[PDB]
Design a protein around this motif. Sequence first.
Motif: not given
Lengths: 170, 250, 306, 164, 604, 532
Positions: C127-128, C131, E428, E552, E554-555
């Motif tokens: 996930s990082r 992102m 992503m 998801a 962080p978005v």
Amino acid sequence: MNRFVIADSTLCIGCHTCEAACSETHRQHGLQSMPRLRVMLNEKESAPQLCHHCEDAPCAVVCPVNAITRVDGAVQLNESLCVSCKLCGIACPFGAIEFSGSRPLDIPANANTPKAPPAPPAPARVSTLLDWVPGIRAIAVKCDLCSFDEQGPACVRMCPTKALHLVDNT
Amino acid sequence: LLGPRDANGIPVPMTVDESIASMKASLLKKIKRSAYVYRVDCGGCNGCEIEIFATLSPLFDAERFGIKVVPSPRHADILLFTGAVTRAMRSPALRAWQSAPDPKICISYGACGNSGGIFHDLYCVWGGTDKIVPVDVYIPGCPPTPAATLYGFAMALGLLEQKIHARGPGELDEQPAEILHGDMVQPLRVKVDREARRLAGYRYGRQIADDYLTQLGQGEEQVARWLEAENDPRLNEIVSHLNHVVEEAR
Amino acid sequence: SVLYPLIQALVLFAVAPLLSGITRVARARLHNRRGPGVLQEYRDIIKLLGRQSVGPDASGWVFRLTPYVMVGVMLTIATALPVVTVGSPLPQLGDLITLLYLFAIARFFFAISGLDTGSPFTAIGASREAMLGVLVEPMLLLGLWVAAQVAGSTNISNITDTVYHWPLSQSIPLVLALCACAFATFIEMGKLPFDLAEAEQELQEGPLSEYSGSGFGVMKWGISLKQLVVLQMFVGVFIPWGQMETFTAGGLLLALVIAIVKLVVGVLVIALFENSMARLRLDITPRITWAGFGFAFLAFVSLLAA
Amino acid sequence: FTFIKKVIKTGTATSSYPLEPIAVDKNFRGKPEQNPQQCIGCAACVNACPSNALTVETDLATGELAWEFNLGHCIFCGRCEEVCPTAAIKLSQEYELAVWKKEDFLQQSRFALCNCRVCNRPFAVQKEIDYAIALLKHNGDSRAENHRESFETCPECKRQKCLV
Amino acid sequence: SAISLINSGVAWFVAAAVLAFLFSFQKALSGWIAGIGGAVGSLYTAAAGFTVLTGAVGVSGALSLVSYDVQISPLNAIWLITLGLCGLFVSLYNIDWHRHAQVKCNGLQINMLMAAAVCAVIASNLGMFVVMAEIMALCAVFLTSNSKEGKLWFALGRLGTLLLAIACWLLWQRYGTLDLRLLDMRMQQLPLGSDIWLLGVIGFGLLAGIIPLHGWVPQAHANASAPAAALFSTVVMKIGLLGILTLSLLGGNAPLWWGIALLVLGMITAFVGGLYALVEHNIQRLLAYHTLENIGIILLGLGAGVTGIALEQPALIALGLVGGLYHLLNHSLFKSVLFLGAGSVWFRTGHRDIEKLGGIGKKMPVISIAMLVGLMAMAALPPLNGFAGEWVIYQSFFKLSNSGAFVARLLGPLLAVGLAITGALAVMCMAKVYGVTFLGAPRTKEAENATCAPLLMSVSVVALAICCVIGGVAAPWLLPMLSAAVPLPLEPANTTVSQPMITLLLIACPLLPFIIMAICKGDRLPSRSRGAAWVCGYDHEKSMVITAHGFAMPVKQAFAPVLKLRKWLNPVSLVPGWQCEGSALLFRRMALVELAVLVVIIVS
Amino acid sequence: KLGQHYLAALNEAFPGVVLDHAWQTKDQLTVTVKVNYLPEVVEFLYYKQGGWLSVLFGNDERKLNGHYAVYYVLSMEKTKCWITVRVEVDANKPEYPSVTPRVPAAVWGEREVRDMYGLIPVGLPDERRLVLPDDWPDELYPLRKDSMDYRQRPAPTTDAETYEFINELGDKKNNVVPIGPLHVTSDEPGHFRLFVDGENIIDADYRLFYVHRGMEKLAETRMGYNEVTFLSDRVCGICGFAHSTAYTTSVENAMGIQVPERAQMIRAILLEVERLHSHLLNLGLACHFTGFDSGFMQFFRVRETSMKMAEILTGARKTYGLNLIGGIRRDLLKDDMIQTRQLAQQMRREVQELVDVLLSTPNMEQRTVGIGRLDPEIARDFSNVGPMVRASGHARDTRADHPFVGYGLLPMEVHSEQGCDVISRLKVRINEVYTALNMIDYGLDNLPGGPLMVEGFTYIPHRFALGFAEAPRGDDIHWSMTGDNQKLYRWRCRAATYANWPTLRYMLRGNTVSDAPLIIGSLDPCYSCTDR
Ligand code: SF4
Ligand code: FCO
Ligand SMILES: [Fe+3]
Ligand code: NI
């Protein structure tokens, strides 16, 4: 010029009341609860043997920590100073020193629960000059004349036949 | 079950199949200049763990031997086990052992890890790292010094050889013990040694009493010239008490 | 022409784990320690290649296939990078969009490997990874875009030739786009304070935690080659004056010497930056990344003004 | 950067161990050395060991006391050196103590037991009796100069002589 | 001729719908009839599209079925190829889709959608294009799961025809015709007003799904069947783009703000769809928002083309109007891939939530590979067919950047920056979708007991993914075949991309680390897949698996105002009768009255 | 006699509740109250009299007076003294009212006396197993004197962990991030359950006591008094001398042993040498957890100066082995005085340069300021100790409030902050390095003369007192009861993080997963101290 307790064999009946009485007064004081006078029995008479409180005192000669001194005409062994080297039990010509240590307080001898496999048993006792148990620090146990007690020697007081008495040669 | 047990349900050490365990020599050869070490604290007091950290220090630097401490057991070549293996740490230690590539080198680090240490027979431990997993290298110490950790790592990687060895019973066992300071009265030597331990402790007391009685065996001027060379006021304090003990003995 | 691009790909892969050795030596020197040699990363990869590759039971072909995919992606990027010549060895792979979307292939595969193991640390690091890749693309594209606008072309050969025959009049947009691309190079190399995915001390270096043995060795090799090709995209385009416009055998030695010196000085300056601070968090990274988008927007405004 | 001056001002602090030794303090508590000649088998060190690195076993069949030191058990406290009567055991400054086989941790001794003159049961270490006899000879004793069989008698049998 | 091919396709679609409705008492036989007829009609439609695109000239004629004038320009031939290539494998999928016990017959709805879509593509009159687009929109809104999911589609979809009918009445009044050929000739002197163009763009974007006229799209796709949702995303939402491109390119004379408005709206649609997809857990709602992202990319291409027409720069026209149409056809291909594969996962599991759908890649491996190809195709990763049209739109953006018009120079790099953001968000989102669905451990017992997909389902999804790989790898050859629709040379600014070089270099280059691991593999023990993942020595619980919700977040933090704009700008409390109890039902009843009267009047 | 006014206030408020009171030291008072007025008495002394709950524990005294005994040690801090509230619990029905509904600091010893003793605090809201492991059998209480042998190892009831975790602020839709027992930041095993929504900690529960060995049972079964001094050195290898000194000055406090003045100051000096390495270990690990591995290397390079001082002064680097009961085992001759004075002045100039490269570290301010906030009235209610409560505004310290060994003769300065976050807990520890260097520099210049130990004393059975040392992480309270001349009766150890861990949940709420190892590290966690 020394103070000690002597036993009379023609009066002693070998009832081991003195061994229990010496054990109780040191267990209350926190000292070693092994009896410091031991009853020996030839088939004809009997008398408990204990520390003579000798003038020369060969036990105090060989002590590597100077735990054995002379207090009030009595040969006194400091139980807290003894490092269990057991040299004094060899040097004593009268067998007045045996070696016992404190067991855990108010814990039974068979403390094993059925919820676990049992603990390993103690090794077989050969001689107190040779035995060692990992939890037990067996120090030198001799007669200290019950010098902590104000009533004097407990073996003399609780002897029913009055076979024990102090010889106050000071 | 994560680990093997006996008929009583008590855990037993994990064996390593002979096919996998026949490759440990080849792994030890190829990790000589590149070793990946995962630390498994199995219930120590943190003493072993932080001398491993001091073996990553700038002073004691283990990375110059190719030793890298890895975040995961998956990266590990060497599994570093510290601690007496507590009951709550048996399962994570076996999980770290199982989630690591085969073959693996096991270094038992510290007295607790080696045999249980001071907790070798307690209820809530198992008694060392060899009671759950097989061990290649034992490093003793409570805790081992970072120099001892560097020596153990270099001996495991083959850079250094083992120096200490077992001493079995021989014949010195029956050669009789000599009397310490035989040119003087032994109860006086006992009293001097006990007085020097009171003031200085067992370590300095034995050193000071032995030197003082060695100088006293030659003369009082020999004691006084020895105190002038040391020029320490605390030692003058201790030797003054020892002289007081010797004067009380006379 | 089918050999220069592959000879360059073989040369960069082989040396990529030596730039990691300069990085780990400079890390040790900044940690006031002797440290290992420069061949420690190669010594660590060759050891891992003979080590058993293990994985979780709830993982499939994606976990086993990802390291080779990332190494092949970095080799594909490395054939198109100007190293010893001003032009690209493979100019039809030299579009900036092509080279930006090729990097997105490897970030996708890195992210799906972390979601394939089932660990919380691998998946959070995946996930990082994705992102940070989201946050850095506006700045990297706008910097490369402004350079392409000052070069009339999105090809990396023509951008490298325009920085080489530096224009002077368009110096301010070129310098600001160079600063934006340098910052973007620092973030894409996963260097601290932007090592938010492989953050040991947090995620047990993220998706690398599940990898073991030969898979971990090829993963470490792909990480080193990715860092090399990102730094090479910066220093072979924006500092191209040691390269040569036409290929000659006589001038090849000086070009490799200057390319090697540029790469070593780049990882030394990068080491001075990464071994000197604390890493960020993902909730505070967008402010700093939007500021690099700012250096790039200032570049974009300075092309519209003039 | 203040960090960079700090790095440049310090330099390299790494030693050359293993090439050059690492100094430990004169009184650093390293491995307990043990002199088997000076040891009397008295187990004073065994009784004071907190981790039970020191063990004695009375092996009647071999007529001996099995003295053993286990380095893997030892917590390096120095109590054995503290309570030793003859100063036989002493903690050295050695720290390079890693092994491949844990049997190499063992420092073993076997002292012949002394059977009692009266009951022929093994009651004490003969070496300890010899040391006590020499100690009493040093202070001027005739029971040591003429009567060793009283020292080689068990305390129970010595209590039987006082009954008469 | 292609007119006879498209007449055969329309006739086969109509006969398939009729015989699917009449033989609907047996669902398997009705599905077989509907799929066979839809496949044959789509084959005829695709053949007509290939014929018009190869011949590079518009054909004219009329259908023999009803009095329907037909012009098939090469611009509309791409839509014919799109519709045929989608509907062929959608109908072949529908054959085995009708084997589920929990689904119903839909082939009448599907084939009427396909017929109305084809007749909208080949439409002559703009009033008739607005008639066939609504016939399609009604046949599409009757493909929803229930009345609740098609209520907003019936409201917005009829609003958009009221606006389109107003625009068509305005065209009738201003020009006296609605024929597109005649309007093209009549608007070389008097231009198309911007009120007409604004009405038509808003009405068509209410069908194409231009954000913020997109509100019906995730509701509509949310629980619809997989052929229905695939046809919504690849046909129905593309007819609105056909109407936008028809209206914008009439007269070859556009105002500058038309292309500027198309590019901004496309950028809004692309970024908002790509961001809003990353906050969805229903796979079909996610693919709906991703359909909206790709609709936004096709408009970024078409708006670049319209801007180049307004600035009289033929390179910008060529790059924009080729990249947008190539992205349109290839989107249709991979969106069909992803919707049909996700429907296969629902067929074998019963779940559309991907948080209850772990580990399908070991249970449905062929579907997993084809879905991987489609999801990488949607993230525009090379050398797949999503990068092929998006690379060309970036070349059009670069042509916009180096223009003289200040508005083109201002928007040019900014649209590229937004497209980079959209592509990274897409990467992503597809990383999340492939990870939490086809990778890891299964999370429900339905995901554990999933078997392989049925035969025609697997054939349709694999053949569509093969067409995606063909449209990706053979892009340097398929791209100049769109020069029939846009008769202009394609000029990238001193650059090129070769997808076959990328194809050969993404397979040969991973073999080198494999070769060196096979050499440096001394006595490495074979590979191990033994236990759970490392969770620091604790037992691995199901809650340690980070899923699509936690991937998801962080978005959700770093795009807070754009994600909060969906709640501030919502006029749901301002419509008076929207929250009534039987509003959706009444919308459905007057939907069948309007569809019935429209079908009755159009046969006449 | 200190605490006479508190006893008068207790007898004024709850007439008749005090049954028996006695003084063990001039600042130590133990009151025996009625068992069902126990939560009112502890709440009265906690809130009305401003006390702090130090340690609560059980004692198997069924062979002394027939009853289980639960002691409630309160630290009077409004001079300052100790109050132990003692109740007698029936042996057949081990039930007593719980103090946790009134005093939130009472949650863990009441959880501990369920595990080790089987007593039932009635009304305790958290009855989860705390000290014993998950594979320990039920109704087997190790600190009971007849329940089990200390060498008995039962078969594991399970291999997988059966511990239940509480998520109050979250739901089942939260994921869990397991930090520990074998994390990179898990220097010692401790499992932390981060109930997260993405990378945002909604709530945090934790499982500990992985390092629990059963040390209090070992101290009364196989060990003598002087052997527990080395056993207390192994409670925790980082603050082992704090445990060694707190155990030693509780047997000596129970017996009135007059330790020589030189041994008390060398005890006070080496407690500051231990403080020097621990705070640099925490500061280095605080640099380490933020990615600043160079600051981890820099602080551990200066930490070796204090390890060199410890090797010179004690003969070992970490496990000192200095304390015997009655004194210490090593003197300080001049090469010891000369080298350690040189190293202490070398340490002061070298720590000062590291604080400058730590407060100027480019992302250290945004990682530490406002992160892991400990609310000050939460810290008062749970009786938090040390730098974690001193950063929260409560300037309480044992070396000043309850002066022990030679700390009345040393330059003591109490260091507190007002910001309640990660950086201020570092800033307390940074300022405590300079104070520890000041007392080492003064102590190495002003040592008394005379002996180092007293010896030959006899232990009077059933005598008890409190032993308190200020460990680097806060107060270390020890309670020793003499059994006979050789063995103890009961040895309770309560370490600093045992009082500091229950507020980690409120400190971890509202932060991120990347902040979570730093927030735990800022508590300066000593797991082996907590678990024993
Ligand atoms: S060996 Fe000693 S220092 Fe190491 S963990 Fe065990 S008790 Fe602690
Ligand atoms: N410092 C320290 Fe150890 C803890 N917690 C104690 O007390
Ligand atoms: Fe005998
Ligand atoms: Ni501690």
